[PDB]
Every structure is written in structure tokens, then in C-alpha cells.
Amino acid sequence: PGLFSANNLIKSRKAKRLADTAYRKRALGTKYKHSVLGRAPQAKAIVLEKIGVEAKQPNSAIRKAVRCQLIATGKKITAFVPYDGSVTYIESNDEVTVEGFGKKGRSVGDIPGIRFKVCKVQNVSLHAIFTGKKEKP
Amino acid sequence: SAALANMCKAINNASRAGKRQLLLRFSTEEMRMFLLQMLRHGYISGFSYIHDKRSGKSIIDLNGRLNRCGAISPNYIVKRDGIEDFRTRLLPARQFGHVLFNTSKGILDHKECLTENVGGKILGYFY
Amino acid sequence: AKMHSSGKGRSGSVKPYATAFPTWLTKSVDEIKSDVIQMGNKGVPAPDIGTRLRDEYGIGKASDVLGESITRFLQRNGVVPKIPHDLESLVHRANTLRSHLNIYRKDNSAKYRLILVSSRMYRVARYYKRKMRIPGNWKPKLVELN
RNA sequence: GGAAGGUCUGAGUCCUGAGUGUUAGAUAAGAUAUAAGUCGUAACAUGGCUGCUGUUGGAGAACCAGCAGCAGGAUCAGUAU
RNA sequence: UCCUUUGGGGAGGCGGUUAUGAGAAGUGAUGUGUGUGCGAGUGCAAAGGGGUCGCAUGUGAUUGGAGGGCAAGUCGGGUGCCAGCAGCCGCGGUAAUACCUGCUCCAAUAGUGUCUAUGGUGGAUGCUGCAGUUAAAAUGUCCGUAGUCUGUGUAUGUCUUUGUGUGUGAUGUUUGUGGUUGUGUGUGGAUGUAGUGAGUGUGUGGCAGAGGACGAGGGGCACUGGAUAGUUGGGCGAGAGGUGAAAUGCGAAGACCCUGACUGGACGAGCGGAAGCGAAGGCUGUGCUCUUGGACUAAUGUUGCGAUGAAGGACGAAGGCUAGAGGAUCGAAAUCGAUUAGAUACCGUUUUAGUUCUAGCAGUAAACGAUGCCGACUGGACGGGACAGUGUGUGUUGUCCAUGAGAAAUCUUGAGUAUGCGGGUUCUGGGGAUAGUAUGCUCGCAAGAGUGAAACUUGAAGAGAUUGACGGAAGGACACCACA
RNA sequence: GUGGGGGUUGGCAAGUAAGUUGUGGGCCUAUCAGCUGGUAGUUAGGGUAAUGGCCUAACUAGGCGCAGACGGGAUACGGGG
């Protein structure tokens, strides 16, 4: 910290900064390498199967999900179908738009292992079919 | 300027204990210019120093009026436009206290440096 | 605050402020100078000369009789050793350790002393080369470890 | 350059050698979340053989034994003729 | 508008289309429609629009919420750990303020919600301005090069060169986002002035040398003390050993016990302590010898020769490994005998590697005070160890009390000297787990050491203290539902 | 010039434009530490509108680096903004 010591301080403080995880993904350029949709905010997919998942205790339930196929990259994923009685509009070989959950890539609530969420069903909003504003596909 | 910082910690220690005098076993030339600027502003009674062909000695006479003194290391370089930012960081209010600089005209506090159009290196403060 | 240990002792001498010239001298001033210049010819080192002046002649500070320090007086009279006494005591200590280690190999205590004694001797040599008192290529003459 | 040809710039083809990525593979060692479990009981009380650290041998499994160390111990300590 | 200015021009201009952003008006009102439509005139290359007039005319709210965070209902009816909700904490099992449906109310309003990236939030990256005894974190120990710091690169007047942005005045496009219009500012350079004067002398930190003392500091040599085991002479005559209790195993070829002689390895009791020394790991028989340290005492020499320290180097408990020597005691592994529901264990018998020395390799520990190094300053009481003095001093060190500090337990030459925050100079940490694991590289005979990730997973894991409950915990009282 | 040999009317100065050249600046990375053969320089010539290893002939052995060289990576056009 003398008045002629600024090269020793830039060298020292750059190395401490790498111990932050959020900064380390950006600095080393590996923030989109292991990510099922890359840089997109939403994505399309075609529906293979229609399964049911248990809630994680201390909650008793069975949450309805679907197994899909990402049209853009050919990766398999599972997504969660939100509302009441809404898993029965979809069929197999349907197309669906999925997006995130909103918590940085972790699961939310008592739903284990699922990181995505169905949003549309054949270009129609799923939330509008449930409120009665639009008609099923 | 290692002797200037040693002196300010020994002064804060005695001013808190209620001492009247302080004897230090060292004395330098610019340690005596800092003390002569507290005397003309009313914050100490006086001092005196001895010549022994060792590092020197000095005796300070305290008053009862000092709240704190400090030194800044390293001695940054401040233009005459940056004088006023160092004042808001170091003094408690806008009406009292003194920040001292080592300019090309001697040692001056922050009111004189503005009436002479100069900057310099910061040394310390007291209020 | 010693160099190679954590010792903090403060012992030592304190010379007076503003000395004077001794009156109690028994010999002459010119008869004393011809003896300080004699002991320098027999190879007596300068810290040991000042101990004879103090104990046997009454001279406490030889800068008041010779007119200057001891090793500047001997220089004008043409007595300039090849190496200063500080540096050559350290070469000699590092040779007596090197020849003890040639008979008693397992003395790990003396092997640690040889490291510290000898890095102290390369620091003092670097000072006399900055100051032009020995050549820029001087090397210590050392017993050879086996 | 009279011409046969020479010179410079040099795409492309054919072959070898490093690099930096990404990926298929019979078999197969882990980790984690589960269910619903089977076998024991190593730790927490002197946890029923005080506990832990390094090292080297052994056992279905926790773990057990030898050599040194630590108290984060179950002792801040006990009458010299 | 310009280029090539009645030639050419998809440059450029003019509309249309679209919840791109920003600004401004509406969805009514009682005395006498802020809208929509048409007609003149204006406008243009030709037209939309707009604004100045008139004629009729009368239309125009949603999105997200109501348990807490966080403004707003214990309102009706359905469902019964189901269906569903919920960023986070959480709700639902016939007694739902949290789900589905109906009312009522709340916030913003031509808008209002969701997914993704990013600034603040974050003194949760710390120049200003964090933390490191026990929560994550001071490295096993010294030496040491580059660098940083110490010892011996500045401010300011005048001129010049460069911004489309922006700070700040003026100005009623009906108001406004705007437009027009005054002034200031951003980087380098030239030339003056001020600091600014220079090595000297002195010897304050360090080092080198002197004097008399002190120390289980180290290597080597020569001797010595008894106990464990064994060999061999004499005595005795049936069991000895060890266990909670016994069993295997040893004993009439005389054990065990008592005595005279010897041999061999290992170890150095008592004295022995909150005592000393060494860089740390470590070091207690006696006498010789070669080496070593810090303190003290002083009118000795020198003259700043220094502090910290990636890279480099040496040393480093126990166990292990390689060669030779040695072999008392103890003892992993193996093996039997017990105990047990079963014990490959705790307890025991037979018996090994190892445990010792010489020469090396290796490089780890709860290598701990779980506590970088150097420098300045600071109350008491009772001690110890060395040196010097004479009624005290310097270097070290143990216990106990304040002040102060701390999340507290606690700390007292520091864990003190104010968020009142800067003395010099390093290292390490950034929620838990995956994991000190994979992979690459360097070192090793090996066993391994050093350096050192990610995918995937998850809401706490942790520190210190408080009151209870419990202990195959310790005490002190008691009682013919306890003994004597 | 005491012989001869070339060229076919192409200019000067401002202004405008263009080419060439010196030093200095926080993308990340050491599981990237040593790199370089026209490579560093000298002397001559060629080529160019023009300086210069820009190119050739001969000769010397240089040049850069923890104040990070030489390498490798990520969604790298630089500024005014």
C-alpha cells in the first residue's frame, strides 16, 4: 500500500475475485456449456409420454408432468403442467412451449427434479384455457 | 512520517487518560512542524525538545481541548480541486477541525490552501 | 530485533556529550602516535587497539589525540589491510565450522550454524562492493567440504 | 525473350504431422434423491473397551488391533521421615 | 435536402403496418356533452392527418391480488393430506382467514402480469471499507532472490491542441417530451515560478571484537548402576502363574521360593518442579574432548551495511521402505481358550514382522497456545530464572485483580490503544455437500506426497451461552412399605 | 561539345485528398516459463511516389521475458456513446 504499489494490488485483487462463483462462470467463459436450452428464454418441444411424480414429503400429492423432446437440440427433459385438471387437454405427439421456474436453475417447492414448466399447448395459452378466455386446440 | 504516526497514537492515549504532560523518546523535524500548527490554533499549551545526539526527545503540554488527531499513510497527492473531498471524510462538522497539507509554501491547513491556489500531499488532521 | 534471532537486548556503551583533551597523560603526544602506528604493523586489529589506549594510556576517545578515527589515521601512514576486520572474522568462523564438519558428519547442530554464519558473510561483502573497498569479483577462500 | 523457354505472385490437388474442441462404445467404479425394506449398533452419558489425529496390518458391514501424539477429558489440586 | 440543381438518383422524402420507448388528453354533467360523423377553407408533387369554422349526434376499463413478509374478508357454498396452491416461510386428514366457485374490498390504471439477462440491494470482494483462538480461514521450522517500504516521479500562472455528450441561464411550440439560443467543462504538450538545497558532520538501528559468569543445546570417546530374561553349582519336596471367575498352557528328567557364579540386550528410577536450553522436531548416569547460544557489563571498531519476502534451499515425531549388524522386554498379523443370541473384538495362552545400532530414502501429525513477522504507546498485587549493582536496573517468564475489548466463553506485553475507521510488509477464507474426489503435471523403490475441478444435488450446516429432560453419573441427608 | 546522345510539350505556388511512420492505455487465463532463422544488426545494390529486411549478396551474433514474454480460450469490429 505504498504510493508506488499499484501493480501489486491489481495482481492481488483479481485472484481473490475468482473465489466468487457467479463471477467465475463469466470470467472463464463457461456459463452456457451445460444448459439444456442455452441462451433462449423459452423453447418448443414435442410430447412423448405423460407421467406423474410424487411430492417430496412432508407433503402428500402427485404432480402431473410430461416427458418431451427439444426440437432445437434433441435433448430430453421433463416439465411440470401447472393448473387443475389441465393435463388432459394435451395428447401425445402434441407440441408445447416450456420456460423456466424463476429461481436460478433450482427446483421450487416440493417438486423434485423438475426445472421447467409448460406454458402453451399448440400455440394457445394454458392459463387462458383454464380461465375460459380461449378454447381448447 | 513513521514518527508522525507514532506521535499521534501516544497523544490519543494520554488525552483519554487525563494526563497533563507527555514525554516521547524521539523527535524529528516535521514532527515539530505539525505540533507548531496545533499551538497557534489553541489545541496545546506548548512543548520543548532536547538535543542528545540520539534520536531526540520531546515533551508536550496538553490542554483539555483535543478530541482526536490522526495521520494518513500513504501521503496521497491532491490537486487544489480535491481538497474539499478529503474534508468531508475526516472532520465531524463544517465549523471546526483542520486538515494539514505539505505544499510548496510550507505546511498549511485547508482554509489557507484555498486562499493561495495550491495543492500538495496530505499529512493529518485534528479536531 | 536482532538479525538472525528474536533477541531484544539493549546492553552497550554510551559515550559522553562533548569530551575534551586529557591532561593526565604521562607520555608525549608524538611518542603515542609512533606506537599506535607500531601495533598496526604487527597486524593488531583496530577494535583491539582502542582497548589498549583506554586501559593503559588513559585515552577514552582517540579522535581527540590522533585528530581523527583510528582507521583513517593508519591509512595516511600507509597501513591498509587487504580485507576489513568485519568481513574477515566471518570468513574465519565459517572455516572452523567447515573443518569440524569434515570429521564429525552427524553434527546437525553445526550444519545449521554454517548456513546462518555464511549468509551473514555474503551480505557484508555485497556492501563493500557497492562502496568500492574490495574488487567486484572477490570470492572467499574456503575449506572444501567432502 | 525473334522464338523454344526463363523468372515473380500463387489458387488448387495429393499426401503426412501437432493442436483445440465435440461425440458413439460391450463392460463397469462412484455420487445423489427415493422407497420399503434386511443385518447389526460404531458415535452422543465414564454411551456400557473415554474420544479424536497421523501411520501400518486385518475383518460381512459399521469398524477392530499395534506404535507415537493431542484435550476439543472423566483430572486446573493433596503433605518428603 | 444534397450529388452531377428541369438530364439521372429505391440516396433521400411521403404515407401504410406494429402494445418499441417517451409526452399529453378522455370514458360524462347539472343550468347550458373533453367523444363520433359529415361540410367549407387551409395543406401537399398528389393525398392522410392536424387547427380555424360550422351541422347534426351520442358511444367508450382492464390486469394482478386479499395467512405473514405487504395495502385489503376468520363472508356464503363445495372438496377432505385428495384435487390443487406456494419466489421464501408455509397450507389441505369433515372445526380451510391460504385450494375450487360467488360476492365484497385493495394497488396501479390504457395498461397490467410471467420467463430470461444485468446495475443496485452487498462493508456478502472490502482503494475508501471486511474477516482469520473456538463459527470458513496464519502456512511444521529457519534461510533467501525479484518486488514493495526504508536509507541516500510534485504543485501552480500563461499559451496551445482536440467531442456529437453533458452541467448551468434565456425563450409560453395552447401546456409537455421537445426545438431554437447564451456561457462552462473532458486529454497530451511547450515555457516560466515555487518546493530546491545537497555532500557535510554526528553515531540513534544492525553487525564485528573484548570481560567474568550461566545453560537436560549438539557430535565423538572412555567408563558405570541396578532390574527383566537366561545358563550353570548348592538347598527344599508339590504346586506356581494370572483372572470378575476360570480355562487352555508350565511342574517328580525337581518347577515356584532361597543362595554362589557368570553371560546378553535394552533402559538411565527416586531427586524431577506451572524450573532451564534449542529454529522447530526435541533434550535428564559420570569424566574427558571438538563445537554452540542468548542475556548482562563497558569513554572499543565501523557508519545505515536495514524490515518483509511468489521463485529457490536445508532441517523435520511415530509408523513405513532399502542394505548390513543385533536380539533382553513388549507386541500388529496368525492361532487356540473363554465370554456371548453371535463376536473374525475387549480378557487370556502359544508364537512373528517390528521395537535397538550404522548408512540412506521418505516428508506426514490435535507437527496445538487450534493464536503471521517487525515497529510506537499503556494500571496494580504476589513470584521465579540469569547478570550487574547495592536498597535499584536490563532481558525473559508463572499466577491473580481492574480499565478497555468481545457474540459470548473468556483475553492482560494482548483477543487493549473508538465505524473517533490509514505505522511497514505477506499469506489464507467467501453457505452446505459432491470432495481433498477425478484429470493433467512435478517428485518417490514403493507406500504415497505436492498442486487441484466440474456435472448433479440441497435450506440450512455451524459458534457460544440459557432453562428443562435424561445418565448401566458423583456426593450429602433420610426411612422397620431399608438394613442392624 | 576541339565528338556526340536523347525527347515530342508533360510547368510553378496555394487549396483539397491520400500514403508512410514514433510513444502510451485493465477482455479472461501459469492445470501456458522460457521464446525467436529474415530472426537482431552492419556494408552494398535493387525496387518504390517515398523511409525501412520491404527484397537480394556478403559478413557479425544478436533481439524479447514474473513491470508476464511465447502460447491457449469466450457471444471480440474500435471510439463518440
Side-chain angles (χ1 to χ4, degrees):
Chain A
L3 192 70
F4 285 94
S5 81
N7 261 341
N8 286 326
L9 274 161
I10 298 144
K11 169 171 164 206
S12 165
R13 299 320 198 241
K14 288 169 104 182
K16 294 159 93 55
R17 212 191 161 175
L18 283 185
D20 176 23
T21 48
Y23 180 60
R24 196 186 328 145
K25 313 260 194 148
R26 326 193 293 102
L28 307 172
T30 48
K31 187 171 168 297
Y32 297 97
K33 258 176 187 58
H34 317 280
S35 74
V36 66
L37 41 74
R39 287 186 65 194
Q42 306 100 21
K44 267 178 204 152
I46 195 164
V47 173
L48 311 172
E49 199 198 346
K50 171 192 317 192
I51 63 174
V53 195
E54 283 193 351
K56 174 261 301 177
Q57 63 89 39
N59 280 326
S60 288
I62 287 167
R63 323 274 188 212
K64 324 283 186 298
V66 305
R67 308 182 66 202
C68 301
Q69 180 74 46
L70 281 180
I71 283 173
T73 63
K75 315 176 175 157
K76 290 180 197 188
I77 71 159
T78 46
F80 160 75
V81 187
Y83 301 99
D84 197 326
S86 82
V87 76
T88 73
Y89 312 149
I90 205 72
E91 291 96 5
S92 199
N93 281 292
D94 276 357
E95 190 165 33
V96 300
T97 317
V98 309
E99 90 287 11
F101 261 127
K103 199 166 67 153
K104 267 156 212 296
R106 281 164 83 159
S107 309
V108 313
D110 57 18
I111 304 194
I114 301 182
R115 297 196 263 170
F116 290 105
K117 207 209 305 183
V118 172
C119 181
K120 293 181 202 185
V121 171
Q122 289 152 342
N123 271 291
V124 169
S125 182
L126 192 75
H127 173 231
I129 302 183
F130 173 79
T131 58
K133 305 283 196 69
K134 300 272 178 295
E135 180 46 37
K136 316 187 313 276
Chain B
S1 284
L4 193 69
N6 285 343
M7 177 188 80
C8 283
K9 288 175 189 185
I11 290 189
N12 282 327
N13 272 330
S15 157
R16 201 176 162 159
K19 301 294 194 174
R20 290 302 146 229
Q21 281 169 328
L22 204 166
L23 175 95
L24 302 165
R25 293 202 249 117
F26 54 90
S27 169
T28 73
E29 299 83 14
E30 97 172 357
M31 185 173 159
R32 289 193 285 272
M33 295 286 115
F34 190 93
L35 276 181
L36 177 56
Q37 212 76 18
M38 286 203 255
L39 181 51
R40 79 180 279 242
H41 279 303
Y43 277 86
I44 74 177
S45 171
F47 61 98
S48 59
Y49 49 103
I50 304 175
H51 195 268
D52 51 0
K53 303 201 297 189
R54 308 181 65 95
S55 54
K57 299 203 181 74
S58 48
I59 318 169
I60 295 98
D61 272 353
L62 304 154
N63 220 352
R65 295 180 183 171
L66 196 73
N67 287 311
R68 185 162 187 91
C69 56
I72 308 285
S73 315
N75 296 330
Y76 305 110
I77 286 168
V78 69
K79 269 174 186 32
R80 190 186 58 75
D81 301 341
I83 299 279
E84 221 54 20
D85 163 59
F86 265 100
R87 205 221 47 93
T88 56
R89 275 190 280 166
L90 299 174
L91 307 171
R94 285 179 63 106
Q95 293 95 17
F96 59 107
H98 303 274
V99 184
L100 309 186
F101 298 84
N102 179 39
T103 78
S104 54
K105 297 180 178 179
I107 287 184
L108 313 163
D109 74 323
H110 68 287
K111 298 149 191 183
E112 315 182 62
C113 285
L114 297 183
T115 70
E116 300 181 0
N117 206 20
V118 287
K121 298 168 189 213
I122 195 174
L123 290 189
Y125 60 95
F126 57 85
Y127 49 87
Chain C
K2 296 325 193 272
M3 191 203 264
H4 281 156
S5 77
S6 45
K8 265 148 100 177
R10 301 169 79 199
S11 288
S13 311
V14 174
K15 281 191 164 101
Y17 195 105
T19 53
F21 185 85
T23 74
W24 56 85
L25 283 197
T26 177
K27 313 198 188 305
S28 162
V29 164
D30 302 314
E31 203 259 355
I32 275 179
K33 294 168 95 76
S34 69
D35 298 1
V36 168
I37 201 175
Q38 197 62 30
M39 293 183 313
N41 261 315
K42 300 176 170 164
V44 177
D48 288 351
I49 294 177
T51 304
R52 285 176 205 201
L53 288 178
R54 166 176 47 79
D55 279 8
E56 281 171 16
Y57 296 88
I59 306 284
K61 155 160 289 172
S63 318
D64 291 6
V65 187
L66 312 175
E68 49 185 350
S69 62
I70 292 194
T71 76
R72 275 183 208 170
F73 178 73
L74 284 181
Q75 199 267 333
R76 307 162 87 271
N77 293 172
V79 172
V80 190
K82 176 81 153 39
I83 305 288
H85 188 244
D86 184 9
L87 174 70
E88 75 163 308
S89 304
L90 280 155
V91 171
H92 181 234
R93 275 207 69 196
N95 266 334
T96 169
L97 272 163
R98 276 167 92 100
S99 77
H100 171 268
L101 275 172
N102 269 340
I103 314 170
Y104 309 106
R105 333 279 305 279
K106 310 294 293 171
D107 213 320
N108 269 330
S109 198
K111 179 204 172 130
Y112 174 80
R113 277 274 98 62
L114 178 72
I115 290 157
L116 312 193
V117 164
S118 89
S119 82
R120 215 185 298 150
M121 156 189 84
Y122 287 128
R123 272 165 90 152
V124 160
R126 166 183 327 142
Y127 165 72
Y128 286 119
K129 289 166 183 173
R130 182 167 90 243
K131 186 176 181 290
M132 293 261 179
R133 174 76 173 69
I134 61 182
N137 286 340
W138 175 90
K139 286 288 186 185
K141 183 47 49 190
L142 290 175
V143 178
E144 198 269 329
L145 281 164
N146 288 355

